[PDB]
């Protein structure tokens, strides 16, 4: 099971793992003045308040700051292969729970998708299950 982490950077269970050096999440980094929601077009303070980066969970729900536990790596246990989406918006580069670098997208239908950053696995993965209701910290400001 992939850990979630508190705002202090400590995992709530299990062991910590490093994020990929080329992820758009750079740690350590503070966060959590509030749970401040945003939208894809308002993706990053700004007019909505404090910004610590980009966070996303299935829904889709986006935040620009978040106080509760978050994933530092995409929990691949909760992703499944899905179909190629022709209309996507790339939002960052995330570490998978497998330690590899993925590009992360939001599809025009609202689905959160990953593609492996390195060539060789052309498939699209989709975040199917919002099991813990914790967002993924995609990028830090």
Author numbering: 21 to 64, 72 to 168
Recite the paper's sentences.
Pestiviruses, such as bovine viral diarrhea virus (BVDV) and classical swine fever virus (CSFV) use a virally encoded protein, the N-terminal protease (Npro), to suppress the transcriptional activation of the IFN-α/β genes by interacting with IRF3 and inducing its ubiquitination and proteasome-dependent degradation. The Npro protein is a leader cysteine autoprotease that cleaves itself from the nascent polyprotein during translation of the viral mRNA, freeing itself for innate immune suppression activities. Npro has a unique ‘clam shell’-like protease fold that is distinct from other known proteins including all known proteases. As predicted, Npro consists of two domains, a cysteine protease domain and a zinc-binding domain.
Here, we report the crystal structures of CSFV Npro and a C168A cleavage site Npro mutant to 1.6 Å resolution. The first 19 amino acids are not essential for proteolytic activity of Npro and can be deleted without affecting the in vitro protease activity. The structures presented here show that the C-terminal β-strand (one half of the product peptide) remains buried in the active site pocket, indicating that once cleaved, the C-terminus of Npro acts as an intramolecular inhibitor and thus prevents trans-activity, i.e, the enzyme is inactive toward additional substrates. Additionally, the short α-helix containing the catalytic Cys69 is disordered in the wild-type Npro structure, which may be an additional measure to deactivate the protease function after initial cleavage. In comparison, CSFV Npro structures do not have a disulfide bond between Cys69 and Cys168 because the active site-containing helix is disordered in the wild-type Npro and Cys168 is replaced in the C168A Npro. Thus, the CSFV Npro structure supports the classical cysteine protease mechanism rather than the catalytic mechanism proposed for BVDV Npro.
